[PDB]
Design an enzyme around this catalytic site. Structure first.
Site, PDB file in Angstrom:
ATOM      1  N   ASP A 174      55.688 -98.545 -90.524  1.00  0.00           N
ATOM      2  CA  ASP A 174      55.930 -97.392 -89.673  1.00  0.00           C
ATOM      3  C   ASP A 174      55.271 -97.546 -88.296  1.00  0.00           C
ATOM      4  O   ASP A 174      54.175 -98.082 -88.186  1.00  0.00           O
ATOM      5  CB  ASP A 174      55.385 -96.148 -90.364  1.00  0.00           C
ATOM      6  CG  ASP A 174      55.574 -94.891 -89.540  1.00  0.00           C
ATOM      7  OD1 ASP A 174      56.715 -94.395 -89.462  1.00  0.00           O
ATOM      8  OD2 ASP A 174      54.577 -94.393 -88.973  1.00  0.00           O
ATOM      9  N   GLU A 200      59.789-100.584 -88.077  1.00  0.00           N
ATOM     10  CA  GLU A 200      60.418 -99.515 -87.326  1.00  0.00           C
ATOM     11  C   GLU A 200      60.110 -99.648 -85.832  1.00  0.00           C
ATOM     12  O   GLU A 200      58.983 -99.407 -85.379  1.00  0.00           O
ATOM     13  CB  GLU A 200      59.959 -98.136 -87.815  1.00  0.00           C
ATOM     14  CG  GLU A 200      60.718 -97.009 -87.142  1.00  0.00           C
ATOM     15  CD  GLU A 200      59.870 -95.796 -86.858  1.00  0.00           C
ATOM     16  OE1 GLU A 200      58.637 -95.925 -86.821  1.00  0.00           O
ATOM     17  OE2 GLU A 200      60.436 -94.705 -86.665  1.00  0.00           O
TER      18      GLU A 200
HETATM   19 CL   LIG Z   1      63.712 -96.336 -90.583  1.00  0.00          CL
END
Ligand SMILES: [Cl-]
Ligand SMILES: [Ca+2]
Length: 448
Positions: A174, A200
């Site tokens: 993330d 991401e």
């Molecule tokens: Cl994603």
């Protein structure tokens, strides 16, 4: 063969385990991206999951035992688990976490104030002209970890390796854009084996930090796909999609994770109104059919809950598998991964994985398209106001086939549960598709 994964957004461990056994495994989904399983701040909003307190496995989804149970049961069903891992920050402010731990003033059970970068705010203009601020300052007040520190790297690596030990096969990093690619390279050198990793990174062009910087550490989310697909389906011509992918300036197919929408952009974070979601009904069905049939990237199907316009709201107060009945399709869990057009698309992708070429492309210059995957499969989408009745050429064996978007072949291959498509002796198909509808057939759904 496995080709598609799914995000069971905010689904608890009990629900995921049952879903793996009863549906995901039998239907052929490759894996499940689960919500952050580590200790996070208390609160009912969905985003509390993105404010870590520690790495203990006690969260809104359940406890450590339930988590382990889920990995085991899904694994036996033939389904991998990908964990959403927070490598950029810890929770903002002060409070208490889901496992009872306290935190405050950049002091956590596993980090001290000295393990974070000095506080500064990331401004919107920083994305285009200051990579230092984007990677060293705070994302909406979240304590920014010093990812260059050997201690911090060892700590995050211990967590990842611990998850691998219990069976986890992949990880979503993330907020990767907010961490220097070199810090990720250094982190990965401490990680055991080679798990599937996808980062991401939102890059639609003109960023000081680009998606291409992360191609050596794993797969990368190609946000241009979600945005352009949505824009074309709503405001353009499907005929433009004949060279979708690298031709439109996207990253290499083999490095991309794609999707029609994700948990962030369906709420207006990282995507505008042109993004297609479950709210769009049949339009969402058609967008998914295109993505799953088209040979670009590693797709992940979205599985949401009706948030009734409240973009901060957490999930339904009832489990998916509730006392024998499925809480899907209505005003609680939407369960898009079970929608016939979407599950049929996954089946098509799984059965055409031996031919990644787009063959015999046909279009009406506007919103009617049809293409094949060699002799492995063929599909067509009609997004005009009138019936698509064109004769198209395929490379498929003559015979009768089940339109997998509307039904399936019976165990003895003697019948379909939905409409039948006929491939003529010369390989052609005389289409008959109504407005806003589609068809998909593959070599392993042929009638005997
Ligand atoms: Cl994603
Ligand atoms: Ca950072």
């Amino acid at each position: 063969t496995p080709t598609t994964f799914v995000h069971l957004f905010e689904w608890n461990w009990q629900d995921v385990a049952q879903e793996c056994e009863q549906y995901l495994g039998p239907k052929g989904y490759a894996a499940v991206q689960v919500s952050p399983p580590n200790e996070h701040i208390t609160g009912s909003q969905w985003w509390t999951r993105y404010q870590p307190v520690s790495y203990e496995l006690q969260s809104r989804g359940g406890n450590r035992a339930q988590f382990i149970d889920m990995v085991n049961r899904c694994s036996a069903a033939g389904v991998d688990i990908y964990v959403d891992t927070l490598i950029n920050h810890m929770a903002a402010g002060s409070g208490t976490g889901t496992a009872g731990n306290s935190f405050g003033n950049k002091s956590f059970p596993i980090y001290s104030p000295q393990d974070f970068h000095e506080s500064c705010t990331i401004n919107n203009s920083d994305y285009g002209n200051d990579r230092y601020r984007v990677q060293n300052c705070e994302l909406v007040g979240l304590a920014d970890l010093d990812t260059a520190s050997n201690y911090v790297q060892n700590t995050i690596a211990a967590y990842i390796n611990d998850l691998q030990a219990i069976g986890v096969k992949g990880f979503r990093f993330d907020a990767s854009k907010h961490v220097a690619a070199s810090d990720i390279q250094s982190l990965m050198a401490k990680v055991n084996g080679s798990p599937v990793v996808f980062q991401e990174v939102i890059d639609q062009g003109g960023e000081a930090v680009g998606a291409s910087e992360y191609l050596s550490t794993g797969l990368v989310t190609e946000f241009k796909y979600s945005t352009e697909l949505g824009n074309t389906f709503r405001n353009g011509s499907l005929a433009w999609l004949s060279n979708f992918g690298e031709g439109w300036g996207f990253m290499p197919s083999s490095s991309a994770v794609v999707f029609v929408d994700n948990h962030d952009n369906q709420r207006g974070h990282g995507g505008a109104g042109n993004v297609i979601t479950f709210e769009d009904g049949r339009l969402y069905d058609l967008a998914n059919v295109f993505m799953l049939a088209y040979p670009y990237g590693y797709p992940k199907v979205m599985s949401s809950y009706d948030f009734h316009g409240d973009t901060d709201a957490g999930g339904p107060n009832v489990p998916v598998h509730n006392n024998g009945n499925l809480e899907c399709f209505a005003s609680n869990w939407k369960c898009e991964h079970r929608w016939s057009y979407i599950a049929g698309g996954v089946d098509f992708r799984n059965n055409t994985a031996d031919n990644w070429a787009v063959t015999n492309w046909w279009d009406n210059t506007n919103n009617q398209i049809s293409f094949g995957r060699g002799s492995s499969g063929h599909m067509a989408i009609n997004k005009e106001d009138s019936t698509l009745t064109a004769t198209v050429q395929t490379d498929m064996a003559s015979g009768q086939y089940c339109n997998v978007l509307k039904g399936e072949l019976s165990a003895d291959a003697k019948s379909c549960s939905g409409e039948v498509i006929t491939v003529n002796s010369d390989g052609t198909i005389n289409l008959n598709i109504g407005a806003w509808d589609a068809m998909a057939i593959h070599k392993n759904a042929k009638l005997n």
